[PDB]
Write an enzyme that holds these catalytic residues in place. Structure first.
Site, mmCIF file in Angstrom:
data_model
loop_
_atom_site.group_PDB
_atom_site.id
_atom_site.type_symbol
_atom_site.label_atom_id
_atom_site.label_comp_id
_atom_site.label_asym_id
_atom_site.label_seq_id
_atom_site.Cartn_x
_atom_site.Cartn_y
_atom_site.Cartn_z
ATOM 1 N N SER A 152 0.814 -1.193 0.000
ATOM 2 C CA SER A 152 0.000 0.000 0.000
ATOM 3 C C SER A 152 0.877 1.286 0.000
ATOM 4 C CB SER A 152 -0.930 -0.118 1.231
ATOM 5 O OG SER A 152 -2.024 0.708 1.032
ATOM 6 N N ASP A 253 -8.012 -3.181 -7.638
ATOM 7 C CA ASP A 253 -7.515 -2.806 -6.330
ATOM 8 C C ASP A 253 -8.533 -1.945 -5.586
ATOM 9 O OD1 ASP A 253 -4.881 -2.516 -4.515
ATOM 10 O OD2 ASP A 253 -6.000 -0.570 -4.631
ATOM 11 N N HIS A 299 -6.552 -5.821 -1.852
ATOM 12 C CA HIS A 299 -5.613 -4.792 -1.527
ATOM 13 C C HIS A 299 -4.597 -5.363 -0.543
ATOM 14 C CE1 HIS A 299 -3.982 -0.851 -1.409
ATOM 15 N NE2 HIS A 299 -4.053 -0.811 -0.094
#
Ligand SMILES: *[C@@H]1O[C@H](CO)[C@@H](O)[C@H](O)[C@H]1NC(C)=O
Ligand SMILES: *[C@@H]1O[C@H](CO)[C@@H](O)[C@H](O)[C@H]1NC(C)=O
Lengths: 349, 350
Positions: A152, A253, A299
């Protein structure tokens, strides 16, 4: 046994609230390979977003709630069944407490607002952790390796700092060490939202870059002299990156869906937007040499036990990463060959 | 469970003595992947050498001593620890009983001499086994794979036949299947021997080609129309090979030392000759896309339990083969040649 908490020798390197930064370490008795993982979890870029973050996600803005040990799966698992190729490496976890995509250099709170009191030191935290691993063994024996990995905001963090960290270890410190990076779910696009947002994507990025005093790679900012903050986007930074970088990106995503303001998808309009989002992500990866991009909604992946189960063309993620490692010791473009959400039989949930 | 003996439907396909050829199989219940291993064991090229072989290595010229089952390690092992990536594939072993490097098409003995009774059907045996795997499941489900692998004369057998077999499956039979080859210890050089041999290499090779009625790949023989037998050498055949081929070669290969007539090395002169042979092998692999070439004395590797233990730059042979497999999945590379140049300089040598 667990990753154990460690302190930094320079006490001026801090989290958002002024608490001291640090890391977690699980030393292996004989390995000369190191996996350093950067945690993620969004960011904040102004007074309002940072106040909301302090109230809703306090643990990302301070070390005052850090436990004495951590257990992380995936690429930091010590279990061979869960981590077939890196289970026996030295493992380091760097918690995310700077809210600045690991880019901040702002030692003291912004002069502009004496009411914005946060310290943004992400870039300086990463550099200090890498410096502190050296007396603990990093690069001590020639022939060793460092894989700097992130999820991330951590994935962005890797991209932003990889060439600098490489140069520090190899040029400044003269170590005989191979450095590589992995970005998991850090490859973001700026594109028209499903519906107008409270503030333009690019406008938040510019404001953050200013607030954080963001440190961006020199080669990339030369291509963007009028908007250097464009270098937060992986596809803009990638062409001038010199160090090997593996990109993992879910084609659908969930963080990109939030950026694009889609909402929880319950109408065909939203689903068609998501379908097109996936195509745009796929296109944005056209020049990447080593990519693993499944057609799944998700994610993050590198810290998850089920990272061993995601396959494209019957090749698992750890297998692909291992083959990239081999090929860059002085890659595979695995992008899903079907284009639609969840068309991969191995998608998690 | 073992590899179980199977017969061929075509009873004209025979070993050297006219006994029927065949193969061994271990079918996996689910897999669409197939490893087909060709055994090796030198060859014979004239009346005298074939006679000697019949007396000293009879089991390589007949199927009359074949057992009902076989156990083969390395890439045909069904155990994950020994075969981390192919333990759960379909496995096939083709015994070597044609003494012709898998290249022969001589279906009927050279009528000119009645004590030369031999049939040399190696190319025909391989083709038939492949054809007979189709009803057993080869390429039945779209998306499957064949890895044709071979050690020693079998490595040569793979290189000689690979494009033919790929063409048969993909073009003739229209199977949606990915084909690749592996040559283990099959990459030989014609070089000046340490001392002169009774028979010179290129002489034996030419004689074998004629005796076997060797079937060579066309795209190579074009380049050597006067001497097509040149195509028995890997370095000569490689440039025109279309199918992906992984080459494993020990840089101090014992078969090369035998052909080069070095003798058991006990003198610095012999050892210096061996050192230079390794340099020549290294150099002959210059243009090969996917290669694993350790600085060790040995011969053969793919059928060995210890294949998991040989490493170059800390990369094991199975891990390199797996990465090549991933990288060639569209039918289109890691060059792992030892970085030191001297015998046994690799700490993982067997
Ligand atoms: C400690 O960190 C601060 C903030 O990065 C820096 O200004 C200072 O020079 C560092 N001190 C030492 C002794 O390196
Ligand atoms: C069987 O193989 C022989 C020898 O190669 C060949 O001549 C013959 O045509 C084959 N018979 C068949 C396929 O019926």
């Amino acid at each position: 046994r667990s990753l154990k908490r460690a302190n930094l020798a320079n006490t001026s390197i801090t989290c958002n609230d002024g608490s001291h930064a640090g890391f977690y370490l699980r030393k292996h008795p004989s390995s000369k390979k190191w996996i350093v993982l950067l945690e993620g979890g969004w960011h904040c870029f102004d007074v309002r977003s940072c106040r909301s973050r302090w109230m809703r996600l306090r643990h990302l803005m301070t070390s005052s709630q850090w436990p004495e040990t951590r257990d992380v799966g995936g690429i930091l698992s010590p279990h061979p069944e869960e981590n077939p190729y890196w289970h026996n490496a030295n493992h380091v976890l760097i918690p995310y407490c700077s809210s600045d995509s690991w880019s901040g250099t702002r030692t003291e709170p912004d002069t502009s607002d004496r009411e914005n009191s946060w310290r943004f030191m992400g870039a300086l935290i990463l550099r200090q952790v890498i410096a502190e691993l050296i007396p603990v063994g990093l690069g001590r024996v020639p022939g060793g390796e460092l894989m700097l990995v992130g999820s991330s905001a951590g994935g962005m963090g890797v991209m932003l700092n990889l060439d600098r960290i490489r140069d520090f270890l190899v040029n400044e410190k003269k170590l005989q060490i191979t450095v590589r990076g992995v970005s998991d779910s850090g490859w973001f696009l700026d594109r028209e939202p499903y519906t107008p947002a409270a503030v333009a994507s690019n406008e938040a990025v510019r404001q953050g870059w200013k607030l954080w005093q963001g440190l961006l790679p020199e080669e990339c900012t030369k291509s963007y002299p009028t908007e250097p903050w464009r270098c937060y986007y992986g596809y803009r930074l990638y062409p001038t990156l010199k160090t090997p970088l593996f990109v993992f990106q879910w084609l659908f995503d969930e963080a990109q869906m939030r950026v694009d303001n889609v909402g929880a998808p319950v109408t065909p309009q939203q689903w068609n937007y998501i379908h097109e989002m996936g195509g745009a992500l796929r296109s944005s990866l056209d020049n990447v040499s080593a990519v693993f991009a499944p057609s799944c909604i998700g994610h993050g992946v590198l810290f998850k036990r089920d990272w061993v189960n995601i396959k494209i063309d019957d090749i698992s993620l750890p297998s692909a990463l291992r083959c990239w490692e081999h090929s860059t010791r002085s890659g595979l473009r695995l992008l899903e060959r079907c284009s639609w959400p969840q068309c991969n039989h191995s998608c998690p949930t």
